[PDB]
């Protein structure tokens, strides 16, 4: 019997497949397999089956899709109202120049618009996950 190049390639393929499965397994320890490296943090798998998990939302993973949707819509409305009022329909620059203080409501309100945006992406993620 002679070990031909085809036989060597077959051995290489079987070795590659089996040992790759082994390395994936817990029996092989490498610096790239630490937390913060390639593998997901234990108990918090971000992507599963090519779909975002609730853990991508961090602390909002326990919020239902319905309440996430309501919060996103409410934050969008309030933040848009605050931004428009601050910028165009109730400008504060003239008052501040005169010496008055801003309308504290508008500044805190305006932050809700990006919060509303991210709350919608969280609502979609939660809904897409069956929650």
């Amino acid at each position: 019997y002679k070990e031909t190049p085809a036989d060597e390639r077959l051995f290489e393929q079987v070795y590659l497949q089996y040992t790759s499965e082994y390395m994936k397994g817990p029996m092989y320890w490498h610096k790239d397999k630490l937390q913060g490296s390639l593998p997901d943090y234990p108990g918090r798998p971000m992507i599963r089956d090519g779909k975002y998990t609730p853990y991508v939302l961090g602390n909002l993973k326990s919020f239902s899709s319905n309440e996430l949707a309501f919060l996103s819509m409410l934050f969008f409305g309030v933040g848009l109202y605050g931004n428009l009022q601050f910028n165009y329909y109730d400008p504060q620059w003239a008052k501040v120049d005169a010496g008055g203080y801003f309308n504290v409501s508008y500044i805190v309100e305006s932050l809700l618009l990006p919060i509303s945006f991210f709350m919608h992406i969280a609502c979609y993620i939660q809904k897409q996950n069956g929650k």
Binding site: K2, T4, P5, A6, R9
Partner: protein, 73 residues
């Protein structure tokens, strides 16, 4: 039997380091000896940087492809 592609047929080279990678050549000949690692012989109309026209490839480095059309490499 013929292990590799038929003589004269066009094969697309799948060797990443080859000057003709992903382009097609003609199978000049195939070595039927099982002990040859790179039996297939493929010639290309485009000479590489070393002005070499033909090369030897293994059975897994060449796949069967249609003859190049007009303006295709």
């Amino acid at each position: 039997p013929w292990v590799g592609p038929k003589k004269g047929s066009w094969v697309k080279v799948l060797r990443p380091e080859s000057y003709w990678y992903q382009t097609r050549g003609q199978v000049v000949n195939v070595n039927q000896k099982p002990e040859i690692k790179y039996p297939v012989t493929v010639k290309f109309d485009r000479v590489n940087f070393s002005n070499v026209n033909t090369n030897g490839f293994a059975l897994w480095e060449v796949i069967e492809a249609p003859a190049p059309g007009p303006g295709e490499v």
